[PDB]
Amino acid sequence: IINRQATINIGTIGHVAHGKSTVVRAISGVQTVRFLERNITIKLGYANAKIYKCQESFKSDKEISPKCQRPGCPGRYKLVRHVSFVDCPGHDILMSTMLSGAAVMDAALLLIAGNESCPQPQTSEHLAAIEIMKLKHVIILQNKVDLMREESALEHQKSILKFIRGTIADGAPIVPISAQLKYNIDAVNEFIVKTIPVPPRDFMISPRLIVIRSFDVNKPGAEIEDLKGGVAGGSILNGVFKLGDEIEIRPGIVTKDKGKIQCKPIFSNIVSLFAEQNDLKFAVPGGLIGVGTKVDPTLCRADRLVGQVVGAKGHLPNIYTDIEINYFLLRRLLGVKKQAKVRKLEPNEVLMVNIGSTATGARVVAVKADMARLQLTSPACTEINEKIALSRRIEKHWRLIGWATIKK
């Protein structure tokens, strides 16, 4: 078996205590770490998957196990692609992590249960978000199908079909698969091979890195001096890294808390890399890699720096405080249990603007008809245009309004 790492990212969406983690487990082999010291930093889940060919009726394709025995052929599998999974929870309070996950993702999998409530706005909202964030590769999957009646499922499918056609996602495949009884995943695997292609990626463009998770390597058992460096789980979109480069977290931090601040952002060199199971040399983008840099084990532990941009020495981007946004509004609101109508923008009110992955608070000053000027409270960086989703407040918690683009 060759040690070729991740190439393309696939994600999973749903609801709490429904069936996403179970699905992930079914897909993979080794159990995940996520769900204070271990794993606890962000609500996002990271898991891997295998694409192995064995082609030497119509539906049979490949087996997840390293050695296939169930169909018949005892031959050795062809290496085509290795993939990394990002698990994102659809809880009503926390969605920043989900948003962050979306930015790195290039394939989306929808999972809704069968033996519960049918019309849910959250799923629709998720779909809308997917449509917005540069995606056409949408696969619909049904979770709990085994505890369902003979025609009810069919009816549900029909209803779904009726619902979904007038969207950005054109020819979306719909597959019903069980996660608790372990069946029918072959079809899914086949689909994964068929529908999803690989976009071009080269060494030319300057590196862009996003760190979601943070880890510390301190476990009880050994004596006093048995220490390892701080590991930062960072996923790459474009820009290849080799061992021997300086990694920096962009926004910066306060040095004394009186006294003026002028200290540059935190620089760190790579000590030990963690990919799939163990160590590797080259970092091919399109996967979440636990990069172990010279950042403190005391710093990376809790909710302090979740979802921030990472650059390299040599190339310099720009940091902004006043942001410029062009907005597009929707007809009626998404993600509300009954539906409510969208009001026009009002001056002097706290609203949350999500640019790419960051969750930041913004205040409205001057809006004519298309352009919007906003004031930031927590630091944020700007590169090109980014995938922007707006969130406004009416009652209790956050609600989506529409999509946005930066004009410069």
């Binding site: 539906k59 199908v145 069919l154 495949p173 597959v175 019903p176 029918n184």
Partner: peptide
Amino acid sequence: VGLPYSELLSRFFNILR
């Protein structure tokens, strides 16, 4: 598009305890 699904459904129906 509504073609490769029915077969899968049939297969699912077939393979049960």
